[PDB]
Design a protein around this nucleic acid. Sequence first.
RNA 1: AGUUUAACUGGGGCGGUUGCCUCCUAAAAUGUAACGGAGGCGCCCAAAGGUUCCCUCAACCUGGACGGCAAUCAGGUGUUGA
Length: 182
Amino acid sequence: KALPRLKQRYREEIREALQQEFNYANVMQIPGVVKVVVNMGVGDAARDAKLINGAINDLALITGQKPEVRRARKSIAQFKLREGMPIGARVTLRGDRMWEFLDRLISIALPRIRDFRGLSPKQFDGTGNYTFGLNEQSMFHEIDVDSIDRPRGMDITVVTTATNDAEGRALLRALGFPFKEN
RNA sequence: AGUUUAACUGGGGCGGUUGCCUCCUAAAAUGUAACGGAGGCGCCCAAAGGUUCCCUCAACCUGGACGGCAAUCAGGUGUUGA
C-alpha cells in the first residue's frame, strides 16, 4: 500500500535476518520496535517557563506531535524546583510516525550532527531498549536554523519487544543505526 | 466613696495551666486521675466538595545531553513501606 520505507524493509528482510541470527521458535518472539520517546527535559524552565514553549515547538516540528508537558513530580530545593511546574516535553511515537521519524533520524539527522563518530551500542537498558541523547536541535532539517535562538537537546529512546541488549542491538543495526564498534 | 483584683496548686506565692482534638498511661468492652508522658487546634478548600470514568505509588536497579544522589525520559523489580 503506502507503508513507511523503514517498516516495509523491516517486515520484508529484518525479521528474517533476526530469525537467522537468533533462531526463534516462534515468529511472535521476533523483536519489533514498540515505540520511540523523545524527552526534552528542560530543567531551566523552572526559573522561567518561557523556554518550554520553544521546546514544544521544536519537538512538534521534529516528530509531528504536540508534546506532553511533564509537570514535576517533586519539589527540589537545589534545582530551584516546585511541584507541578513545566519541566520537560515528552513525545511518544508509535506506528507510522515512529517509522518515519526513525528513517528521518537515521538517514538525515545523525550524519548532520557535528563530528559524528557514531553512537554507542552499550547504551541499552538491559532489555533491548536503546536510549541516546542529543545536545541541540539543528540536526533536524525540519527546523529553520535561523529560528534557533537557544540550543535544546533531547533524550531519544527506542523501546522494542527484544528481551536483551543483543537482540536489540541486532534490530537497531539492521534498521541502520550507527553503532560504532565498541 | 463603693467595690473588684479567679481557681488548680503534694502549704501558699512565683512559674505554669485552664476549652477542643489524637496517642500512651488505661490493667485486650466503655470509662478512668495526677503540675503523668508526647503532639496539635482556634484553620484551610469555590476545590482540596459532589458525581462519573480512569490510574496506582514510594523505593531500588539499568540505560539515558546538559543533569549532578536526586528534575524530565525509557524499561524492569516493586502489594504497599509512598
